[PDB]
Protein backbone atom coordinates (compact mmCIF):
# COMPACT_ATOMS: atom_id res chain seq x y z
CA UNK A 1 0.00 0.00 0.00
CA UNK A 2 3.20 2.17 0.39
CA UNK A 3 5.45 3.62 -2.38
CA UNK A 4 9.26 2.65 -1.86
CA UNK A 5 12.61 3.39 -4.08
CA UNK A 6 13.61 0.04 -5.02
CA UNK A 7 17.36 -0.57 -6.21
CA UNK A 8 18.27 -3.11 -8.85
CA UNK A 9 18.65 -6.46 -7.02
CA UNK A 10 21.68 -6.28 -8.93
CA UNK A 11 23.14 -3.82 -6.88
CA UNK A 12 21.90 -5.25 -3.19
CA UNK A 13 24.08 -8.43 -4.13
CA UNK A 14 26.97 -6.69 -4.88
CA UNK A 15 28.15 -7.87 -8.35
CA UNK A 16 28.78 -4.91 -10.34
CA UNK A 17 32.01 -3.85 -8.72
CA UNK A 18 33.71 -6.72 -9.70
CA UNK A 19 32.67 -4.89 -13.16
CA UNK A 20 34.21 -2.28 -12.11
CA UNK A 21 37.24 -3.26 -10.64
CA UNK A 22 38.02 -5.14 -14.16
CA UNK A 23 37.90 -2.10 -15.64
CA UNK A 24 39.96 0.03 -13.13
CA UNK A 25 42.63 -2.87 -13.54
CA UNK A 26 42.31 -2.39 -17.44
CA UNK A 27 43.28 1.05 -17.01
CA UNK A 28 45.60 0.80 -14.62
CA UNK A 29 47.86 -1.02 -17.16
CA UNK A 30 47.23 1.66 -19.37
CA UNK A 31 49.83 3.85 -19.72
CA UNK A 32 49.34 8.21 -19.69
CA UNK A 33 51.52 8.76 -23.10
CA UNK A 34 50.97 12.62 -22.64
CA UNK A 35 52.02 12.33 -18.68
CA UNK A 36 54.90 11.71 -17.03
CA UNK A 37 55.46 8.27 -14.85
CA UNK A 38 55.79 9.89 -11.57
CA UNK A 39 51.42 11.25 -12.35
CA UNK A 40 50.73 7.75 -13.25
CA UNK A 41 52.10 6.46 -10.18
CA UNK A 42 50.18 8.68 -7.75
CA UNK A 43 46.85 7.71 -9.79
CA UNK A 44 47.49 4.25 -9.23
CA UNK A 45 48.48 4.07 -5.85
CA UNK A 46 45.61 6.17 -4.94
CA UNK A 47 43.90 3.56 -6.71
CA UNK A 48 45.15 0.86 -4.68
CA UNK A 49 44.05 2.35 -1.41
CA UNK A 50 40.70 1.52 -2.30
CA UNK B 1 38.93 35.55 -11.80
CA UNK B 2 39.94 32.24 -10.46
CA UNK B 3 42.17 32.61 -7.66
CA UNK B 4 46.59 32.61 -8.04
CA UNK B 5 46.77 30.07 -5.24
CA UNK B 6 44.31 27.28 -5.62
CA UNK B 7 45.62 26.83 -9.42
CA UNK B 8 49.11 27.36 -8.69
CA UNK B 9 48.67 24.89 -6.14
CA UNK B 10 47.44 21.83 -8.85
CA UNK B 11 49.96 23.21 -10.97
CA UNK B 12 52.82 22.82 -8.29
CA UNK B 13 51.78 19.48 -7.41
CA UNK B 14 51.51 18.71 -11.11
CA UNK B 15 55.44 19.78 -11.38
CA UNK B 16 56.28 17.81 -8.34
CA UNK B 17 59.38 20.14 -7.58
CA UNK B 18 62.13 18.37 -5.97
CA UNK B 19 64.21 20.92 -3.31
CA UNK B 20 67.71 19.70 -4.42
CA UNK B 21 67.92 20.06 -7.69
CA UNK B 22 67.85 22.74 -10.15
CA UNK B 23 64.90 22.74 -12.69
CA UNK B 24 63.94 25.07 -15.27
CA UNK B 25 60.18 24.78 -14.10
CA UNK B 26 60.37 27.37 -11.03
CA UNK B 27 60.91 30.10 -13.98
CA UNK B 28 57.72 28.82 -15.09
CA UNK B 29 55.61 30.88 -12.39
CA UNK B 30 56.79 33.97 -13.12
CA UNK B 31 54.29 36.98 -13.25
CA UNK B 32 51.06 34.94 -13.15
CA UNK B 33 49.53 37.69 -11.02
CA UNK B 34 46.44 39.64 -12.29
CA UNK B 35 46.93 43.13 -13.17
CA UNK B 36 48.98 41.77 -16.09
CA UNK B 37 46.44 39.80 -17.52
CA UNK B 38 44.66 42.85 -17.37
CA UNK B 39 47.25 44.90 -19.04
CA UNK B 40 47.64 42.26 -21.77
CA UNK B 41 43.88 42.34 -22.01
CA UNK B 42 43.57 46.03 -22.81
CA UNK B 43 47.00 46.30 -24.42
CA UNK B 44 45.97 43.61 -27.44
CA UNK B 45 42.75 44.66 -28.01
CA UNK B 46 43.99 48.60 -28.40
CA UNK B 47 46.32 47.64 -30.35
CA UNK B 48 44.02 45.43 -32.61
CA UNK B 49 41.82 48.20 -33.27
CA UNK B 50 44.87 50.58 -33.81
Known sequence: ??????LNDNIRNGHV?????????????????????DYKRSIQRGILLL | ???TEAQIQKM????????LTIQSETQFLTGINSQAAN??????????LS
Open chain 1, 1 to 6: GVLNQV
Open chain 2, 12 to 19: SQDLQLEA
Open chain 2, 39 to 48: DCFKTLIAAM
Open chain 2, 1 to 3: LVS
Open chain 1, 17 to 37: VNQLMEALMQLSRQQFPTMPV
